[PDB]
Design a binder for this molecule. Structure first.
Ligand SMILES: CNC(=O)[C@@H]1C[C@@H](O)CN1C(=O)Cc1cc(C)no1
Lengths: 138, 104, 87
């Protein structure tokens, strides 16, 4: 359902990483399958040849944390009036999600069950961000 | 330009923002509205340095670069009992526990 | 106006009412301009208050949002407070 339109209409795009994260650009192919593209280091940009109606999303390359592009989740290349700017930024994560990111970055998944915290938190830590789960949408 | 602060005295912390162009006196009027103590019964500090009333927050070193929402700058506050100002004293926050075996 | 958030160790944090209302749990606790947190120490509660300012400053901003920093030593306890407050 959430997939790229096969328009065959070229659209020049600039991916601008305005985040402190290494960015993984993800293209949703014609079958709705997430296709990863080369990573973007923190303060860098990239010119990419894309197409009108194509669907893109951006995640942190190492942890898969969700990022924003032009203040929303999905980027759709439009008609070049020249190139379309894709401003990738950190969202304002909730304090809980931000904490889970830090705890996950320090503790190996085998050891989440060794932390002195409520049971519901072990499940929240194990429920890592994921493109597939995010694809609902809906 | 907004500057983000922590006004601290003993075990009291006020989280507030002000303009870089606003004065030390204007900050004392903010403290007045909250703590109910007039500006003449107040002394403001940047570390151990007493701040002059007519000086702007920017001139006192509170800039957008250093007085951020996620990392606000500390302003020390001292009250006068009568007569005689009390020494500047800020109670430190609690100590975090030792990092658990799995985090190090 | 302002509200007072008191830590388990007696530190009193005075924040703007609008900033504290960001927490649904706090909003419920005030509905009496003081909230006592018998389980949240000051090194955690001070960071919660920085989060409120960070959230209000950067929500619907369009510019560049910086990372909200969390020292590894504070992470576990901040996570537990965030989970309780639904921050
Ligand atoms: C170097 N550029 C790319 O890989 C872009 C990015 C994305 O739009 C899919 N894509 C393709 O070429 C795949 C494709 C060809 C045609 C024709 N329609 O789609």
């Amino acid at each position: 359902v959430l997939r790229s339109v096969n328009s065959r209409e070229p659209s020049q795009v600039i991916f601008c990483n305005r985040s402190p994260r290494v960015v993984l650009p993800v293209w949703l192919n014609f079958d709705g399958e997430p296709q990863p593209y080369p990573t973007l280091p923190p303060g860098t940009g990239r010119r990419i040849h894309s197409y009108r109606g194509h669907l893109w999303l951006f995640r942190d390359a190492g942890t898969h944390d969700g990022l924003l592009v032009n203040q929303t989740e999905l980027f759709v290349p439009s008609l070049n009036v020249q190139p379309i700017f894709a401003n990738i930024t950190l969202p304002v994560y909730t304090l809980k999600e931000r904490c889970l990111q830090v705890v996950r970055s320090l503790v190996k998944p085998e050891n989440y069950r060794r932390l002195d915290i409520v049971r519901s938190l072990y499940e929240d830590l194990e429920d890592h961000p994921n493109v597939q789960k995010d694809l609902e949408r809906l | 330009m907004d500057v983000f602060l922590m006004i601290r005295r003993h075990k009291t912390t006020i989280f507030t923002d002000a303009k870089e162009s606003s004065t030390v006196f204007e900050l004392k009027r903010i403290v007045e509205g909250i703590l109910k103590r007039p500006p003449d019964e107040q002394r403001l500090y940047k570390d151990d340095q007493l701040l002059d009333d007519g000086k702007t927050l920017g001139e006192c070193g509170f800039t957008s670069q250093t007085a951020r929402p996620q990392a606000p700058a500390t302003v020390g506050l001292a009250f006068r009992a009568d007569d005689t100002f009390e020494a500047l004293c800020i109670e430190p926050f609690s100590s975090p526990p030792e990092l658990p075996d799995v985090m190090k | 106006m302002y509200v007072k958030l008191i830590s388990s160790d007696g530190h009193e944090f005075i924040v703007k009412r609008e900033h504290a209302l960001t927490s649904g749990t706090i909003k419920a606790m005030l509905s009496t301009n003081e909230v006592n947190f018998r389980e949240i120490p000051s090194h955690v509660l001070s960071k919660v208050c920085m989060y409120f300012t960070y959230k209000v400053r950067y929500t619907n901003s369009s510019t560049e949002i910086p990372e909200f920093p969390i020292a590894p030593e504070i992470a576990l306890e901040l996570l537990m407070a965030a989970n309780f407050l639904d921050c």
